């Protein structure tokens, strides 16, 4: 077989995004998660049909689901969709 996405690879990607790319995760919550007044956000998991985020705002916290348009077959699909969603979201606030 081809190599699939796994829970261990998901965890490696989520930690690298939370350590160094936290600003991008707050943008995903605002543009694709329909949240307002986001103070920060973190990736709890990524899976073949979407990702789960923890979102802080107005002194409170909540968890939300963002669904992908097409299923992910492997970690290269995951890498590509995270970069495409960030390019679209930067465009919203800079138009």
């Amino acid at each position: 077989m081809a190599d699939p996405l796994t829970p261990a690879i998901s965890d490696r990607i989520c930690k690298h995004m939370n350590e160094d790319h936290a600003s991008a995760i707050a943008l995903y919550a605002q543009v694709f998660g329909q949240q307002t007044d986001v103070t920060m956000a973190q990736m709890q998991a990524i899976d073949p049909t979407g990702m789960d985020l923890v979102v802080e705002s107005e002194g409170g916290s909540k968890t939300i689901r963002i669904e992908f348009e097409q299923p992910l077959k492997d970690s290269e699909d995951a890498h590509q969709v995270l970069i495409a969603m960030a390019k679209q979201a930067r465009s919203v606030g800079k138009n």
Binding site: S23, I83, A86, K87, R90
Partner: peptide, 11 residues
């Protein structure tokens, strides 16, 4: 804000 291609498109 930083564009992702600044570190992820090597050309």
């Amino acid at each position: 804000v930083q564009k992702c291609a600044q570190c992820h498109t090597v050309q």
